[PDB]
Design a protein around this ligand. Structure first.
Ligand code: MG
Lengths: 84, 129, 148, 92, 142, 199
RNA sequence: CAUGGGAUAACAAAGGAGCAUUUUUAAAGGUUAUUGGAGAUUAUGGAGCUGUGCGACAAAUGCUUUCCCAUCUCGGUGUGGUUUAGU
C-alpha cells in the first residue's frame, strides 16, 4: 500500500490502475514489492502499446478528414469554374 | 418453425394431387422450389404455374394435371456420387422405367438421368413420379 | 559499442541471436535501424514480418530470426488461449463422417504452437502454423501468419 | 410513470444537479426549472426546499418513490433526495 | 405471443405492396427528418414517433418518404437510444415486476412471469452483444 | 452554345442531332416553363437514344441522365416528358436514369459486399419505374409456361389506363432493348383485392 | 495431395454515419546510378511530402441547393386524357 500510494503521488499510475492494484494487493496477488513493481511495469508497457496504436488510428482518421475536405473544396472550385 | 421450404412445398403438392385438386397454392416460394417445379414441368408432371410477387417470400399457384402420383423432399440433402444413382433409384423410385430423383449439382438443379448424362454428382433434393 | 538494451535483457543471462555477432558491424544483416539483426526468408511463399526484420526481440524459437526451420504440414486454426509465454493453443474444428449413420460429428483438436513476438494474436484470430522440430513437450508448430 | 420518462429524457439530453445542497444553490440562482423531491426526504429539509421553490416560483414535484428509487430513475447507483433540472433539454 | 407462452395470436400490421407515398402528401423529406428528430428530442421512442406521424401528419411510413428508417435517422443525428428500445421496455418490465414482488412475496404468478421476462432478456442481450449494439461484458442484473 | 450546358461536358464537343435538339428544348424550357424553371438549371442529360418500335407509329426518344438527378427529374417528370413530346412530333420521350450494374460475383464474401442498388434486379425494376413513373406497379406475376418460358406480367392501376395504355407497347419494347428482358402489362381496377380489369 | 465446377450448404466478417474520384500542368519550399576504378567531400537534379494555382473528365443522389436574419386556347398523343395559358 505504501508503494502504491507513492506511485500514485508520483503519477506513475493513474487512480484507476491504483484502485485495481489496491484491491489485488488486498487479494494476495503480489508476494512482495518486486512482484508488484513487475506487474506495474507490464501494465504500463501494455498501455503504451495500446496508446501508440490509438495515436496511429487517430492520425489516419485526421488525414482522411483532410482529404475529404480538400476534395469538397476542389469540387466547389470546379462547380464555380464550370459556371461560364 | 418451418425448417425446409422445399419440403413444405413438395408436401403441399403431394397432398393436392392425392385429393385430386386442379390447383394448389404454395407458400412460401424460393429459387429452389421454382427450380424443382421447372424440372417436374419439363417432364410433364405438372402444368403451368404462376409466381406471385408480394415483396416478401412469394407465392406460387401450380396447375395440376393428374399425372403426379407423389412428390417429396429428401432431408437431409445426402451427397450422391455418380456411382450412387442406382442406389437411390432402387431405394426411392417405384421402378427403373419411370420416376426421377432431383439433384443439386454444381451444374444446377436437374433430374438424375440428366445428371448421370453430364457425369456430375451432387446432393439429393427430392423425387417425383 | 551499443548500450545494453534494458527491455530485451531480463533473463539473468544475456539474450542474443546465435547466428550473428551484434558487436561488429559489417550489409545484409543490418536492418533499417542500423543494428545487426539476423533474419531469414522461410520457404513456401511466407513473407517475413516487418517486426522480425526491424524489431529488437530475441527468440531462439522464432521461424524468421533463429535456426527453427519449417518443413512438413502447414495447418490452419483459430487461437484458443494465449495464457502461456510466447506460446498459444489453437483449435482445429472439423467434421468427422460416421459411415453407418451417413452423418457428421463436430470434433476438435488442440495444438500447442510457438508464437513469435512478431505476431500479437488474440483469442478468435485465425493463424497459419508450420511444422517444426520438437521445441517442448507438446509444441510441434510455429505461427507463420495471423489473419484478424 | 410520466415523471420517470421525463427524468430519463433530462438525463439523456438536459442538464441537472443532484443533492440537496446543489439544488439549493441552483434555486438561489435563477437556474432551476423543476425540483423533484423523494418521499423519503427528511421533513425539515423538504420544507426548506419547498420554501425556496415557492420564493423562486419553481415547479416542485413530489416523487412517489424514496431516494433510492429517485437515484435509480436517474440512472444512478446512489441515492438522491433532491433533484434539480437546470436545462429541461427539450423535455418539457 | 409465441415465445414464452401458448399464445398463437396473428395480430399485426400488413405493409402495402405500393411503397410510393401518396400524391397528396406534400411534406418534404427534410421536413419529416426534422419532425422525427425533434420528436425524439421531445423524448419519444422510435415506435412512438412513428405512431405520432402516422396518426397526425398522414405519414404512413417514414421510410417510404425519407428513404430511411426512424432509428436510422436517430443514429445519424446521434439520437439513438443507448440501450435498444425493446430491451429497454423488457428491462423496465422486469424492474416493475421486481418492485411488485418485493411487497407481494406470495405473488407466485408474477414470479413465474419474472423468470420468463429475464430468460427472454438473456437471449435478447446475447443477440445485441453478438450484433455489437451492446458492449461486450454487458450483463442484466436482477 | 448556351443550350449545350444541358449536356454532359464530354458530349458538348460534337453533340448528336437528337441530343442537340433535346438540349435546345431543355434550355428553352428552363426559362419559358414556370415549373421547369425551378429545376432545369441544376439539370443536364447524358445522351439521347432513338428507338424504333416495330409495327407502330412514332419513335421513342430515350433520354439518359445522371442518377444523381433522380429526385430532380421525378419532381417534374410528367411536365418534362409532355413538354419534350410536343417539341418532337411523332415521338415518345422517356427519361431513364443511367444506372450501373455490378456483375453478380462468384464468391460468397464478395456477394455480401455488393451494393444492393447496383444489382441487375434492382436496376431493371428501377428502369421500369422510370418509364412509367406517374403510374406505379401494383402487382407482378411470373407466368411459367409448360415449354420452359417465364414471362413477367406487370400490373398497373386501372385509373392510369387512359394515360399510359397508348405508350405501354413502346415501354415494353424499350424495356427489352435496354434490359434484354421481356415484360407484359396488365391493369388491376382493385389492386388491393388483386382484381384484374378485362378492358 | 493437385486440379475443374459453384447449385445446395458450412466457416469467418459486419450490424451499415460504427462511413472514403481521376487525369493535365506549371511553379514555392524541405544511406542510388553516371562522371575511367577505388576512398572522401560537394552540388545538381529525379522520385516521392505538403501547400499555391491550372487544364480535361467523371460522380449512387440536385449545393445554379438547404437552413438561418432581414426588404417587400396552344402543341403533342389516342379515338379523351396530357404540361401550359385564358377563365
Ligand atoms: Mg421455446
Amino acid at each position: 500500500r505504501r508503494l502504491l500510494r507513492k506511485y500514485r503521488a508520483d503519477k506513475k499510475i493513474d487512480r484507476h490502475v491504483y484502485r485495481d492494484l489496491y484491491m489485488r494487493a488486498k487479494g494476495n496477488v503480489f508476494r512482495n514489492k518486486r512482484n508488484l513493481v513487475e506487474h506495474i511495469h507490464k501494465i504500463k508497457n501494455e498501455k503504451k502499446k495500446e496508446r501508440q496504436l490509438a495515436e496511429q488510428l487517430a492520425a489516419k482518421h485526421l488525414r482522411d478528414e483532410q482529404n475529404r475536405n480538400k476534395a469538397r473544396k476542389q469540387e466547389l472550385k470546379k462547380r464555380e469554374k464550370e459556371r461560364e | 418453425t418451418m425448417m425446409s421450404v422445399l419440403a413444405n412445398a413438395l408436401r403441399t403438392i403431394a397432398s393436392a394431387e392425392r385429393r385430386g385438386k386442379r390447383q394448389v397454392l404454395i407458400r412460401p416460394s424460393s429459387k429452389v422450389v421454382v427450380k424443382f417445379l421447372q424440372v417436374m414441368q419439363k417432364h410433364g408432371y405438372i402444368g403451368e404455374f404462376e409466381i406471385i410477387d408480394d415483396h416478401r417470400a412469394g407465392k406460387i399457384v401450380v396447375n395440376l394435371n393428374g399425372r403426379l402420383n407423389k412428390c417429396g423432399a429428401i432431408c437431409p440433402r445426402f451427397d450422391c456420387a455418380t456411382t450412387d444413382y442406382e442406389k437411390w433409384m432402387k431405394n426411392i423410385l417405384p421402378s427403373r422405367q419411370f420416376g426421377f430423383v432431383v439433384l443439386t449439382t454444381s451444374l444446377g438443379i436437374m433430374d438424375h438421368e440428366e445428371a448421370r448424362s453430364r457425369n456430375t454428382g451432387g446432393k439429393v433434393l427430392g423425387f417425383f413420379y | 559499442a551499443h548500450a545494453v538494451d534494458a527491455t530485451i535483457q531480463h533473463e539473468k543471462a544475456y539474450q542474443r541471436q546465435t547466428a550473428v555477432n551484434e558487436n561488429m558491424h559489417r550489409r545484409k544483416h543490418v536492418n533499417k535501424s542500423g543494428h545487426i539483426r539476423y533474419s531469414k526468408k522461410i520457404g513456401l511463399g511466407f513473407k517475413t514480418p516487418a517486426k522480425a526484420l526491424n524489431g529488437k526481440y530475441i527468440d531462439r524459437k522464432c521461424p524468421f530470426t533463429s535456426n527453427v526451420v519449417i518443413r512438413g504440414r502447414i495447418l490452419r486454426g483459430v487461437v484458443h488461449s494465449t495464457k502461456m509465454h510466447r506460446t498459444i493453443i489453437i483449435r482445429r474444428n472439423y467434421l468427422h463422417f460416421i459411415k453407418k449413420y451417413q452423418r457428421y460429428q463436430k470434433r476438435h483438436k488442440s495444438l500447442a504452437v510457438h508464437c513469435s513476438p512478431a505476431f500479437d494474436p488474440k483469442q478468435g484470430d485465425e493463424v497459419v502454423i508450420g511444422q517444426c522440430r520438437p521445441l517442448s513437450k507438446t509444441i510441434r508448430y510455429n505461427v507463420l501468419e495471423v489473419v484478424s | 410513470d410520466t415523471i420517470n420518462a421525463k427524468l430519463q429524457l433530462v438525463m439523456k439530453s438536459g442538464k441537472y444537479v443532484l443533492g440537496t445542497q446543489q439544488a439549493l444553490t441552483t434555486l438561489r440562482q435563477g437556474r432551476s426549472k423543476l425540483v423533484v423531491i423523494a418521499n423519503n426526504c427528511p421533513p425539515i429539509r423538504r420544507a426548506e426546499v419547498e420554501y425556496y421553490c415557492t420564493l423562486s416560483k419553481t415547479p416542485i414535484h413530489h416523487y412517489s418513490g424514496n431516494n433510492l428509487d429517485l437515484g435509480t430513475a436517474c440512472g444512478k447507483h446512489f441515492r438522491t433526495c433532491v433533484l434539480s433540472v437546470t436545462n429541461v433539454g427539450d423535455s418539457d | 405471443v409465441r415465445m414464452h407462452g401458448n399464445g398463437r395470436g396473428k395480430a399485426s400490421s400488413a405493409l402495402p405492396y405500393r411503397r410510393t407515398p401518396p400524391a397528396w402528401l406534400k411534406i418534404a423529406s427534410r421536413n419529416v427528418v426534422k419532425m422525427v428528430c425533434k420528436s425524439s428530442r421531445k423524448g419519444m421512442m422510435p415506435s412512438q414517433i412513428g405512431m405520432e406521424l402516422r396518426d397526425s401528419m398522414g405519414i404512413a411510413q417514414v421510410k417510404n418518404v425519407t428513404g430511411r428508417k426512424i432509428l436510422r435517422i436517430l443514429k445519424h443525428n446521434g439520437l439513438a437510444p443507448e440501450i435498444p428500445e425493446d430491451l429497454y421496455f423488457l428491462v423496465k418490465r422486469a424492474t416493475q415486476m421486481r418492485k411488485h414482488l418485493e411487497r407481494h412475496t406470495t405473488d407466485r404468478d408474477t414470479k413465474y412471469r419474472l423468470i420468463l421476462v429475464e430468460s427472454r432478456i438473456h437471449r435478447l442481450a446475447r443477440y445485441y452483444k453478438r450484433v455489437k449494439q451492446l458492449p461486450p461484458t454487458w450483463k442484466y442484473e436482477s | 452554345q448556351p443550350h449545350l450546358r444541358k449536356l454532359r461536358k464530354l458530349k458538348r464537343g460534337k453533340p448528336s442531332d437528337l441530343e442537340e435538339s433535346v438540349a435546345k428544348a431543355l434550355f428553352e424550357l428552363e426559362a419559358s416553363h414556370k415549373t421547369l424553371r425551378q429545376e432545369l438549371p441544376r439539370f443536364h442529360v447524358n445522351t439521347v437514344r432513338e428507338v424504333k418500335v416495330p409495327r407502330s407509329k412514332k419513335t421513342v426518344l430515350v433520354v439518359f441522365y445522371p442518377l444523381r438527378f433522380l429526385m430532380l427529374v421525378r419532381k417534374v417528370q410528367r411536365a418534362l416528358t409532355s413538354e419534350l413530346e410536343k417539341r418532337h412530333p411523332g415521338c415518345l420521350v422517356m427519361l431513364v436514369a443511367q444506372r450501373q450494374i455490378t456483375k453478380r460475383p462468384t464468391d460468397v464474401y464478395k456477394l455480401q459486399k455488393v451494393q444492393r442498388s447496383k444489382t441487375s434486379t434492382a436496376v431493371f425494376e428501377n428502369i421500369l419505374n422510370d418509364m412509367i413513373y406517374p403510374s406505379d406497379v401494383v402487382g407482378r406475376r411470373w407466368r411459367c409456361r409448360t415449354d420452359g418460358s417465364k414471362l413477367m406480367k406487370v400490373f398497373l392501376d386501372a385509373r392510369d389506363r387512359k394515360r399510359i395504355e397508348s405508350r405501354l407497347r413502346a415501354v415494353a419494347y424499350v424495356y427489352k432493348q435496354l434490359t434484354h428482358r421481356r415484360v407484359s402489362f396488365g391493369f388491376m381496377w382493385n389492386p388491393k383485392l388483386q382484381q384484374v380489369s378485362t378492358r
